[PDB]
Amino acid sequence: NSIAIPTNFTISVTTEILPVSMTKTSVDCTMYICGDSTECSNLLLQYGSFCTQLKRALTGIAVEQDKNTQEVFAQVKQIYKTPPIKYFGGFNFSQILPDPSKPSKRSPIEDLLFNKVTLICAQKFNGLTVLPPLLTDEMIAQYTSALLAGTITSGWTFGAGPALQIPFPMQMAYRFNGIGVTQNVLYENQKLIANQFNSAIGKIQDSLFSTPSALGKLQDVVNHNAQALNTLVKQLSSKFGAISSVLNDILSRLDPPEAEVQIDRLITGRLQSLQTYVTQQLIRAAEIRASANLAATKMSECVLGQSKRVDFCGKGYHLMSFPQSAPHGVVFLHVTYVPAQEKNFTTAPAICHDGKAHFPREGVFVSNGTHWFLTQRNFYEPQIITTDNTFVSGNCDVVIGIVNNTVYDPLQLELDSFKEELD
């Protein structure tokens, strides 16, 4: 018969970082294997359409990466704007909203994320090029801004139909009902909640600013693709059994009948290097696709709604989420309600009054040692146990652990006062 019930709460903001896209690469198979060498190219033709398959695999990856970015961020039909007066019940969103004074119009947090993670082929000029993404960083920031403005001014309604404006504190009140806490808890404590939110956001900036490893998930993607390309270029210096790694030297010193042997050895080595590179890129692309699909699911369920999936949208009971753009990925700020300062109370499954078994409609019966009250499960708020708060099913001889207490009938009390005097 012992139950603990939170008497306070904390608004917590946590960060989830997910890759969305990968560097899009393109390889000129002939230049890589047989750079500016007719004799090598003519020998390369005897291996069939391998360069063509490699071209399709890399093109398919590049297209998929643009699909992944589009699927994660372009989830809003319209580009929403916040009002000129950025007052939302006392909730300060200035560190997640676009900063209009800076070029690129990114929020302070997005600018930090872009500064922490690190067109002309100056490097790796061996047939290996990088294609730009279809959406620019500014376009991604604009989608993020639209999603954020939608959530702040319209709540969850913009994600399932037209955007419907609602005062922010009432949006929060609905989110509180979602987790299972009544609206009056929010309204009575609105200033406390706004202050806890603002503090948590400041902590997010301090955490990202002071922790170099915070964005490791995105940096690892950048590092792995850079390493893959550096390895692919390094394989060109290998001899693979040939007298020289340079085709110009082989053609310069040897007659065609010998050069073809040395060239074929190099063609085999370079072709194997390209197949290894492309296979690894296909595997990483599949991994990124899975991550992007998770990010898109989280965008739809955490940002454009309220999720009741445990730990899906941060640790704690989910209230709301806000997206932020990051290089090659997305960062979600998950705002949750965390119970705090629980108190230890006596409980019972039912109250026995006049032989009837009374069960709570929305809550748990608790006792502060001497008196029985009905409370909401997630926030201590004792109320008198009445026939409005409970329902009756069966008698007192069935429920195990039933305790004896008065249930107050609101109407019967009137019957004994309204005509107490008879006349």
């Binding site: 039909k77 929403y80 294609l131 279809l134 959406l135 376009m139 319209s154 955007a163 404006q165 005062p167």
Partner: protein, 89 residues
């Protein structure tokens, strides 16, 4: 056509000098050469009117065949219609 990763000046010079490896040529007249981050786009007139993306090119630029007779145009793609929500207390 799009020449990837190159400055339009370098392409124009390579064309003038008869140095460019592919032997076909695109008319490359005034206002049909547009510099993008993806590369040098030749054969499409750039306009300041955004539209939904049709054929992607890159770095925010898409091209489409539009009536303006009809020709291929390049534009910065639109992300969506603007809707300012009437938020109040």
């Amino acid at each position: 056509v799009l020449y990837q990763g190159v400055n339009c000046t370098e392409v124009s010079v390579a064309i003038h000098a008869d140095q460019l490896t592919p032997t076909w040529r695109v008319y490359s007249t005034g206002s049909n050469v547009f510099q993008t981050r993806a590369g040098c786009l030749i054969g499409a007139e750039y306009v300041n009117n955004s539209y939904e993306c049709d054929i992607p090119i890159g770095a925010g630029i898409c091209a489409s065949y539009q009536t303006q007779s009809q020709s291929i145009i390049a534009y910065t793609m639109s992300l969506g219609a603007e809707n300012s929500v009437a938020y109040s207390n």
